[PDB]
Design a protein around this ligand. Structure first.
Ligand SMILES: [Ca+2]
Ligand SMILES: [Ca+2]
Ligand SMILES: [Ca+2]
Ligand SMILES: [Ca+2]
Ligand SMILES: [Mg+2]
Length: 409
């Protein structure tokens, strides 16, 4: 018969955090494959005692005293579990050594020896020992010695966002200098140093497109996309009317019916190097403005971050261009026969214009005009053509005309 008590396996030490649930399993086996009782108790008391305290240490064994319930491949599982009260002490003496016993169907119970038989030490620790807070991304503030409330709110936001796995009911406070104090549900705390949360914003926004020339073709609507970023990731204002000289050409463009749109200007994190703030200028330089030496508008732009640093005015230009700079006529697919190359007839000119037209649909503007000259060369006149700024192309006669005169003898 069986004279051997079951074998108990369990962790010698379980760290339990105040205000949280804890759980671990005792595993029990026996040669018979059956265990009838599994007990957790305090050391004091008679051999038959199962007295156990405090009331929040709990345990249960679902499958007691059934055959085959306690084998090496499938041991009997005893659940030890509870919730540590929020106000429990967390001194070095706030620990519990509890004794675990098991008894087989033949009545063989494991011996109970103070400080030596099967036991576990449940150690109650503050919630701050479980959690290690992650540094947030830095908040760039006007004055790292005296944070505003919006500064504080932002630091809390970046702490939370970087620490999703802290207890949801944790509370955050930010000092006048940005030092973060995290208070856990049990009142224990953690600190994130001011050096790790904030710095004073010392860098003004950057205009990526400084010095750039944006070409606008006369009579064709165009766009110019200007890009800006800031070390803080955030720009609050973009300004083109810094001084009189810059403000007058800005207002000149607006009077031509241009628009300036910066749709993300009020979004947070709207201005990083990887995802810059974009201002788009849209409009048409009308043909009444000529291209040439003074055919430019020169602008100055400044950008301001949320801490009030404004960049040094930087320059960009819109440069006027004739449409002919953009287009190249295709030559006719065939030449046109002409009886006298020095003076084309009407029907010859009409036939040349048709071939040039057909050769350039989908290439030149639909509203280009062609003049077939007396020598059969062809003047291509773009819609922006004016006397002060001609926009034109010439197709030479050797590409359009073919002499039909017969050869001598
Ligand atoms: Ca046994
Ligand atoms: Ca901690
Ligand atoms: Ca800045
Ligand atoms: Ca051209
Ligand atoms: Mg208008």
């Amino acid at each position: 018969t069986d004279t051997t008590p079951p074998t108990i396996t369990l962790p010698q030490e379980v760290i339990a955090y105040r205000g949280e649930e804890f759980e671990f399993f005792v595993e029990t086996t026996d040669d018979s494959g059956r265990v009838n009782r599994v007990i957790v108790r305090n050391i004091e008391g008679a051999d038959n005692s199962t007295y156990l305290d405090p009331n929040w240490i709990r345990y249960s064994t679902d499958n007691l005293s059934v055959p085959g319930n306690a084998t090496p491949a499938n041991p009997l599982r005893t659940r030890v579990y509870g919730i540590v009260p929020i106000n429990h002490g967390v001194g070095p003496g706030d620990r519990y050594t509890k004794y675990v016993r098991a008894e087989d169907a033949a009545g063989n119970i494991t011996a109970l020896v103070d400080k030596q038989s099967e036991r576990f030490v449940l150690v109650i620790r503050p919630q701050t020992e479980k959690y290690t807070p992650q540094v947030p991304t830095l908040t760039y503030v006007q004055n790292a010695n005296s944070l505003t409330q919006t500064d504080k709110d932002a630091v809390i936001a970046a702490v939370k966002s970087a620490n999703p796995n802290l207890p949801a009911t944790s509370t955050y406070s930010v000092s006048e200098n940005g030092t973060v104090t995290i208070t856990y549900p049990d009142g224990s705390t953690d600190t994130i140093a001011a050096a790790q949360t904030v710095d004073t914003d010392r860098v003004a926004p950057v205009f990526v497109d400084e010095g750039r020339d944006y070409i606008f073709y006369r009579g064709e609507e165009g766009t110019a996309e200007l890009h800006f970023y800031d070390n803080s990731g955030k720009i609050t204002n973009v300004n083109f009317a810094g001084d009189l000289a810059a403000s007058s050409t800005y207002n000149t463009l607006l009077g031509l019916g241009f628009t300036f749109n910066t749709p993300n200007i009020n979004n947070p994190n709207n201005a990083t190097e990887q995802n810059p703030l974009v201002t788009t200028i849209r409009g048409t330089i009308p043909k009444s403005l000529p291209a040439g030496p003074g055919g430019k508008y020169t602008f100055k732009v400044r950008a301001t971050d949320a801490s009030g640093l404004t960049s040094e005015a930087k320059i960009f230009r819109i440069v006027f261009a004739n449409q002919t700079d953009k287009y190249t006529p295709n030559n006719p697919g065939s030449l046109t026969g002409v009886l006298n190359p020095q003076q084309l007839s009407t029907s010859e000119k009409t036939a040349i214009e048709e071939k040039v037209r057909a050769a350039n649909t989908g290439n030149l503007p639909n509203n280009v005009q062609y003049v077939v000259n007396n020598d059969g060369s062809v003047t291509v006149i773009y819609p922006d053509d004016t006397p002060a700024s001609r926009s034109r192309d010439t197709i030479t006669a050797d590409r359009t005309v073919q002499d039909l005169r017969p050869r001598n003898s």
